[PDB]
Design brief:
Pfam families: Ank_2. InterPro entries: Ankyrin_rpt, Ankyrin_rpt-contain_sf. It contains 12 helices and no strands. It has one domain: Serine Threonine Protein Phosphatase 5, Tetratricopeptide repeat (Alpha Horseshoe). α3 packs parallel to α5, α5 packs antiparallel against α6 and α9 runs antiparallel to α10. The protein has 183 residues and is mostly helical. 52% of the residues lie in helices and 0% in strands. The termini are far apart. It is elongated, with a radius of gyration of 18 Å.
Length: 183
C-alpha cells in the first residue's frame, strides 16, 4: 500500500487497486495514509475515492485515525475536504473525546475551533467535560466551560464532571471549577 500511495503519480497508476482496497481492519487507503501521516497523499485520495465517512472495524473514520495519531496537518486537510468532526466510533467516542483522552492539546483546540460538539456523549454518558475532568486535562476543562459546556451533566456513575475530578484527585481541574463557580 505505502508504495502505491507515495505520491500523486503512484496514486494515478494504481487507481483500480486503490479504489476497493480494504485491509484486515476494513480500512481504506485514505485511513492508512492518515495513520502514517502521509500528508502528501490525502487530497488526491479524497478527490479520487471519497469515502470520508467510511468506518473501520472499530468504527473509526479517517479523521479518527488522524486524531488518535496526533496528525494535525492531516486533520486540517480532512476537515477542509468535509470530514465530519462529530463522527463517533462504535464506543460513541468522538474525535474531541480521543484528543482529550490522549492529551493532544493542540489537536483538541483545533477540533473545537472546527465545530467539535462540546456536549456530545459517548455510550456511557460521558460528555467532553466529564472526560477532560477524569483525565485531568485542566486547560481543556477551562476551554469547554468557556464554550458553554453543561456543568450539570451526569454519566453512568451518576456523578458530574466536578465530582469525578474530585474522585480522580485532579487538583488543577478542581481549581478551574472553583474559579468558575466563584466568578
Amino acid at each position: 500500500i505505502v508504495e502505491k500511495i507515495k505520491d500523486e503519480k503512484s496514486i494515478n497508476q494504481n487507481l483500480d487497486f486503490l479504489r476497493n482496497y480494504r485491509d484486515s481492519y476494513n480500512r481504506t487507503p485514505l485511513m492508512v495514509a492518515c495513520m502514517l501521516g502521509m500528508e502528501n497523499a490525502i487530497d488526491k485520495l479524497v478527490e479520487n475515492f471519497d469515502k470520508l465517512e467510511d468506518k473501520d472495524i472499530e468504527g473509526s473514520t479517517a479523521l479518527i485515525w488522524a486524531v488518535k495519531n496526533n496528525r494535525l496537518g492531516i486533520a486540517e486537510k480532512l476537515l477542509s475536504k468535509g470530514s465530519n468532526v462529530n463522527t463517533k466510533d462504535f464506543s460513541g467516542k468522538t474525535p474531541l473525546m480521543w484528543s482529550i483522552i490522549f492529551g493532544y492539546s493542540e489537536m483538541s483546540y483545533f477540533l473545537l475551533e472546527h465545530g467539535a460538539n462540546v456536549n456530545d456523549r459517548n455510550l456511557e454518558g460521558e460528555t467532553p467535560l466529564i472526560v477532560a475532568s477524569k483525565y485531568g486535562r485542566s486547560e481543556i476543562v477551562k476551554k469547554l466551560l468557556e464554550l458553554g459546556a453543561d456543568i450539570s451533566a451526569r454519566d453512568l456513575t451518576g456523578l458530574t464532571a466536578e465530582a469525578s475530578a474530585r474522585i480522580f484527585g485532579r487538583q488543577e481541574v478542581i481549581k478551574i471549577f472553583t474559579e468558575v463557580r466563584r466568578a
